[PDB]
Write a new protein. Structure first.
Lengths: 722, 23, 25
């Protein structure tokens, strides 16, 4: 596949010694005239719910249509922040790391300055038209085909740019192909300013920064070629055609007057190029953002090997669209001069947020804080632990701590409808931080999360050495190797040996396990100092963490609410208490001395026993033993935990139970009820309704009322899961 | 009280414990 | 609010732990 250009009609020159700089093709003394003609003849642009339409009354065009204003949205302005809020805002097109772009060359191209890429869109659903922008040159029809982009720097490491608009997840490919010669920067700027500003009223698109822009763009007109590649039409002919044609064959063509331009459904540019130009701001924003993320990597300390993960962690749910520039200008230009195939008559994505990684990062931060505050204060009870913890996990604190990573400069916070205070911004930083540390916890090891949060906590580097390097537990401190030596003359460990054999867990320091079973009744002892009210705290923390990770990984299509629900039904009081009772932790409990005649324990107490055992397991071992434990005693029984759960609603129970099903790629739907039979007289009525979850029928009910019938159907669908 | 659950639990715990003994 | 004082006390205790930490050396 080889790329080729049309001949240079004395305009361009490929002379070796007539080149200026690292240029290949130079513009002769015949291009300046054409440029002046194009500039003087096609430069006439700069020469000349009720309250919303009322405020648009000044110089109306046609219909109600929707024209674009420099800085304002469909309803009022698109900005209501501050003066210094410009340089710290990302919607204002201010990316950290972007400086002044050195001007390339006046006319002559820049092969040694511009890196060429070809921009296509897959799949082409809104690409090919019956009336494409076709220009004829040397007795050959040259058809339009995407855009060519010239960057002032290599992309090196940038992921795929995906964006959804026409209810289709489009992919803007930017394949580095051979560079079509015979072009000039001044000409590309002429066409860009004639299209992206004049014809298409696309203001508020800062490709510079308030001098050359960030990316150059050249139209592509291909004629195709046998036994080879294809031929690209040179720029001079593009200018010549756009100049000569600006003077059912008129069907599907874009016309402009002095609104901006409209697409005649009933200049020689049709609804082909315009539609293909509305994908460019998205790609440019994407590239620039991923280019400024390299300055984020040095702030974090950890370099993400997956840009998509970092971006998704930085994405904010305030983004209703994935477009680059102002949504108003985009939709307006798409509806006024976009593509529109002939008519015969003439559900948002919540998984693209950072709420997932926030849901994970909550458990991550919780776990780090819990563990560190646990080991660094072996004398402090549960009260001070929970106090410190709650004092740290606080959202305001997490926001102020998130500012140390300059997350406010890398966040994708969009402008709201009208209300946009500091609260939304700082809160956004707070959540996005948890998303970040969640992602770091995911890709990088847990130790990376420890290092991140630890380094971010204390400003003094002397305090970090203590926080990061927490000492072993007092019951592990006394005995370097193990407590197996102490078993021989142990009173309680003899009992716990059975508990070790029944689970197959051979504890290293049995003092921990003995502590985990020491109820709040007893005080202090030789075998165990204090009760397990600390391991209840730490236990709750590690349980929440592991469960959160499991539900995050094995349910990648469930949003925040679904994961929250499933976790609430996976790790609650009655559940872990039931597990604790099933393992038989009642008999191995430690209370009083001999006052406890029967083995009657409260449900909550059993829950505390399970949590404390998991904490002791984590301390004596690691998170793997915990994960295994919950993988045998919690996770696979998730569905079961919903079946024998407390009743509330057959519909809700069936919904949550069906929420466990093998979700593919589409978000999990809710059980659909379809009425089958409506029989009976005016008095009585026997309704027969069947449940349809994602097509397949699960159970069928027959009741006197519609709600009772569908509840009967839901119950029938719940009995089938037994 | 289910002996089956603690049986499978003992199985996997023994499995992991013996897995860390092979490294 | 109170969390500020709590965090302050935390920093103090960390300074104590660090002082003891290097005191061990
Ligand atoms: Zn603003
Ligand atoms: Zn340039």
């Amino acid at each position: 596949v080889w790329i080729r250009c049309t001949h240079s009609e004395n305009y361009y020159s490929s002379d070796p010694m007539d080149q200026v700089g690292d240029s290949t093709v130079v513009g002769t003394s015949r291009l300046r005239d054409l440029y002046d003609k194009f500039e003087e003849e096609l430069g006439s642009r700069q020469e000349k719910x009720x309250x919303x339409x009322x405020x648009x009354x000044x110089x109306x065009x046609x219909x109600x249509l929707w024209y674009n204003d420099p800085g304002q949205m469909n309803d009022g302005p698109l900005c209501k922040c501050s003066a210094k809020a410009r340089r710290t805002g990302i919607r204002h097109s201010i990316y950290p790391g972007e400086e002044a772009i050195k001007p390339c060359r006046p006319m002559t191209n820049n092969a040694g300055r511009l890196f060429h890429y070809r921009i296509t869109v897959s799949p082409p659903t809104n690409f090919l038209t019956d009336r494409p922008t076709v220009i004829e040159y040397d007795d050959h029809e040259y058809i339009f085909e995407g855009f060519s982009m010239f960057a002032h720097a290599p992309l090196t490491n940038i992921p795929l740019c995906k964006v959804i608009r026409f209810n289709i997840d489009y992919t803007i490919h930017f394949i580095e192909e051979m560079m079509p010669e015979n072009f000039c920067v001044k000409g590309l700027e002429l066409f860009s300013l004639f299209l992206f500003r004049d014809i298409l009223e696309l203001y508020d698109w800062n490709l510079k920064g308030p001098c050359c822009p960030r990316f150059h763009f050249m139209p592509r007109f291909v004629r195709f070629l046998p036994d080879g590649g294809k031929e690209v039409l040179s720029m001079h002919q593009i200018l010549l055609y756009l100049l000569r044609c600006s003077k059912x064959x008129x069907x599907x063509x874009x016309x402009x007057x002095x609104x901006x331009x409209x697409x005649x459904x009933x200049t020689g540019i049709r609804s082909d190029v315009c539609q293909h130009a509305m994908m460019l701001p998205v790609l440019t924003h994407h590239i620039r953002y991923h280019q400024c993320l390299m300055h984020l990597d040095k702030l974090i300390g950890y370099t993400f090997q997956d840009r998509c993960l970092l971006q998704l962690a930085m994405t904010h749910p305030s983004h209703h669209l994935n477009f680059g520039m102002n949504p108003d200008h985009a939709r307006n230009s798409l509806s006024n001069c976009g593509i529109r195939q002939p008519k015969y008559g003439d559900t948002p994505s919540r998984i693209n947020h950072n709420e997932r990684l926030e849901f994970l990062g909550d458990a991550v931060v919780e776990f780090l804080t819990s563990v560190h505050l646990y080991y660094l204060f072996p004398s402090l009870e549960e009260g001070g632990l929970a106090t410190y913890r709650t004092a740290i996990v606080q959202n305001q604190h997490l926001a102020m701590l998130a500012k140390k990573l300059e997350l406010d400069r890398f966040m994708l916070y969009a402008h709201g409808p009208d209300l946009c205070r500091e609260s939304d911004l700082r809160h956004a930083m707070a959540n996005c931080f948890q998303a970040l540390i969640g992602a770091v916890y995911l890709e990088g090891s847990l130790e990376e999360a420890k290092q991140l949060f630890g380094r971010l906590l204390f400003n003094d580097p002397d305090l970090r050495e203590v926080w990061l390097n927490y000492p072993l537990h007092p019951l592990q401190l006394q005995e370097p190797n193990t407590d197996r030596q102490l078993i021989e003359t142990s009173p309680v460990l003899q009992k716990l040996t059975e508990f070790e054999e029944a689970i197959g867990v051979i504890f290293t320091h049995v003092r921990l396990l003995a502590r985990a079973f020491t109820l709040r009744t007893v005080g202090f002892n030789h075998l165990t100092l204090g009760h397990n009210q600390r391991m209840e705290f730490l236990g709750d923390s590690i349980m929440q963490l592991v469960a959160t990770e499991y539900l995050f990984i094995h349910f990648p299509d469930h949003h925040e609410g679904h994961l929250t629900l499933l976790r609430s039904s996976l790790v609650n009081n009655r559940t872990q208490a039931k597990v604790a009772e099933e393992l038989g932790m009642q008999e191995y409990a430690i209370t009083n001395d001999k006052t406890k005649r029967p083995v009657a324990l409260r449900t909550k107490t059993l829950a505390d026993l399970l949590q404390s055992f998991i904490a002791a397991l984590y301390i004596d071992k690691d998170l793997e033993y915990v994960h295994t434990f919950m993988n045998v005693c919690f996770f696979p029984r998730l569905k079961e935990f919903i079946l024998n759960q407390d009743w509330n609603d057959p519909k809700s129970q069936l919904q949550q139970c069906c929420l466990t099903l093998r979700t593919e790629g589409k978000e999990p739907d809710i059980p659909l009820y379809k009425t089958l039979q409506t029989v009976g007289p005016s008095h009585a009525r026997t309704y027969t309704v069947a449940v349809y979850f994602k097509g397949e029928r699960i159970g069928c009910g027959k009741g006197p009322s519609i709600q009772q019938a569908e509840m009967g159907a839901a119950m029938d669908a719940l009995e089938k899961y037994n | 009280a289910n002996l089956h659950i603690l049986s499978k639990l003992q199985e996997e715990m023994k499995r992991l414990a013996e897995e860390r003994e092979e490294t």
